[PDB]
Design a protein around this ligand. Sequence first.
Ligand SMILES: OC[C@]12OC[C@H](O)[C@H]1O[B-](O)(O)O2
Length: 339
Amino acid sequence: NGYWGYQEFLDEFPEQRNLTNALSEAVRAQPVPLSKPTQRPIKISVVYPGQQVSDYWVRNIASFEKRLYKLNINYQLNQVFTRPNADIKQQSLSLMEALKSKSDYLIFTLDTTRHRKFVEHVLDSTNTKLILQNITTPVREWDKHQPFLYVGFDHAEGSRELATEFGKFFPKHTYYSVLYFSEGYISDVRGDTFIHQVNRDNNFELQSAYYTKATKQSGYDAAKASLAKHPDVDFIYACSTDVALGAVDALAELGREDIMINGWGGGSAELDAIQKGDLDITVMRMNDDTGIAMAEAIKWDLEDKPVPTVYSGDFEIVTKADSPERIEALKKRAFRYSD
Ligand SMILES: OC[C@]12OC[C@H](O)[C@H]1O[B-](O)(O)O2
């Protein structure tokens, strides 16, 4: 809403579908170093959220840097971390701070319904080229000047896949509860998608939905509260890794192994929980592809080639029944750079 669907957007602009497809080919393919030399090293800023159970961000940067090295790109990387739970006001402060650096590229994430126009005005202000992480759905308003790249693993797709699995695990009319992220974009695209699908297709009944602070502790708290008010459910759908892992501790504490719970993203900690059996299911994203895509995107730009506006990587579904070999194989695929 105010957003294009990833696939919708690629349909509407064929040239974009081409560029994105070309890029995915450039990601799958072996590194091809930089065609066009530079006058100086390029300066890149990263404003990321810190201290999360989720290893997505650190892995992203890892695979990113490794790719830039492989491409023979000479970069200087200024990192900044936001402590938690950093207010959106604080995050955007960290952001303005990173803008002073007058970098060539600026990689970051910010909730883009709660700070739509802010980011728009930032886009208008600088010559720094923006990379928006963790959003794969372009904003309609910004068709005049879109950022350099939205990069991520489509939230709607991953939530569709999970909805598809839950419809597979349970009868029509099954009771469940939902643990959202914080109020915002992510909860809208991960949560409300899942709920829409599961209500329409499987006639599931949503007992309750709770917002969180996007932290493990918060996930624990919200799970406890929710199950206190609404004990009778067959699963809980969680919108992020940290919240899921908190909810697990809650379900253990409460003795509720009659309740099923999913992860989101399938990083190391989730996979470990899946192998313990603490986590019933997850949608594991092929993590490093987006780190590698950003480096390929920068390469092109420096060769003066056109760059796609968006890139989404792919998911696989992982269940606690999967073989160690399949898990291992998927790690081989997903962390092929960050290990
Ligand atoms: O992609 C990163 C992320 O999205 C929200 C949160 O920051 C992370 O937790 B997650 O569930 O692993 O996915």
